[PDB]
């Protein structure tokens, strides 16, 4: 029984290595990584790989790993797939922990834009969670944390992290992680998966996929939103993505909105993440 070596980048930046039978479904590898992480609330997470075009794809747990990675290396990342709008209601602290680690990467990467004050406040909770109570002995007037807090670090930002860290004396790691999440969950790009696209007129837009629905970013004043309940049918054909928008009261017909994606693979990927978000965040 032939086994393939799998390498998974964990959210703390370390590498987990295991073996699975070469005909294994994605669920097999996912279960091994989740057991390694002592993670029970597995439903919010998944594994990503890079396709032949270097695009991030979700590893489908129902399908063979080899028929997804195809010609590519068996290298993956462990990531949050469904960002909970209500992190307080997750049953375990360790779930909230992995969600914080993902969000810290969302912030440092620039995928999750954040004001100066929120960067400093999120930083201060991470520092409290990881070092515990503020200690002056560690930090002088010229202190710069090992912690990456932001896409661009400034001395002013480091100073504000410390000032807020001082206010958190006695806060437990679980408590600081919950505060991190209560702030992060409010950011306008929290849990928004962005896809480049063109509207039916050729104008360049972003489509955002998240808990509350499909978002269409056209300009800083032209932002459309389709709550999942208002979405009957999601389809793709060639380079095109389509959503069937439910008839308004007393309207005779559904409305159809069409987008142009860069290529057929980009259209399919957007369709799949939409269907998965629609299913997941249909109901409670
Ligand atoms: C605490 N989790 S949440 O995403 O905020 C709500 C939710 C969705 C599903 C499924 O289970 N719970």
UniProtKB/Swiss-Prot annotation:
GO molecular function: actin binding; cytoskeletal protein-membrane anchor activity; structural constituent of cytoskeleton
Domain of life according to the entry: Eukaryota
Statement: the UniProt record of this protein carries the keyword Acetylation: yes
Function: Tumor suppressor that inhibits cell proliferation and promotes apoptosis. Modulates the activity of protein arginine N-methyltransferases, including PRMT3 and PRMT5.
Taxonomic placement: Eukaryota, Metazoa, Chordata, Craniata, Vertebrata
Portion of the full sequence shown: 107 to 390 of 1087
Location of this chain's protein in the cell: Cytoplasm, Cytoskeleton; Cell junction; Cell membrane; Cytoplasm
Protein name: Band 4.1-like protein 3
Gene Ontology BP term (one): myelin maintenance
Gene: EPB41L3
GO CC annotation: cell junction; cell-cell junction; ciliary basal body; cilium; cytoskeleton; cytosol; glutamatergic synapse; juxtaparanode region of axon
Domain annotation FERM: ranges: 4-284
Keywords, sorted A to Z: Acetylation, Actin-binding, Apoptosis, Cell junction, Cell membrane, Cytoplasm, Cytoskeleton, Membrane, Phosphoprotein, Tumor suppressor
Tissue: Expressed at high levels in brain, with lower levels in kidney, intestine, and testis. Detected in lung.
Subunit structure: Interacts (via FERM domain) with CADM1. Interacts (via FERM domain) with PRMT3; the interaction is direct and inhibits the protein-arginine N-methyltransferase activity of PRMT3. Interacts with PRMT5. Interacts with PRMT6.
Principal subcellular localization: cytoplasm
UniProt keyword rRNA processing present: no
Organism: Homo sapiens
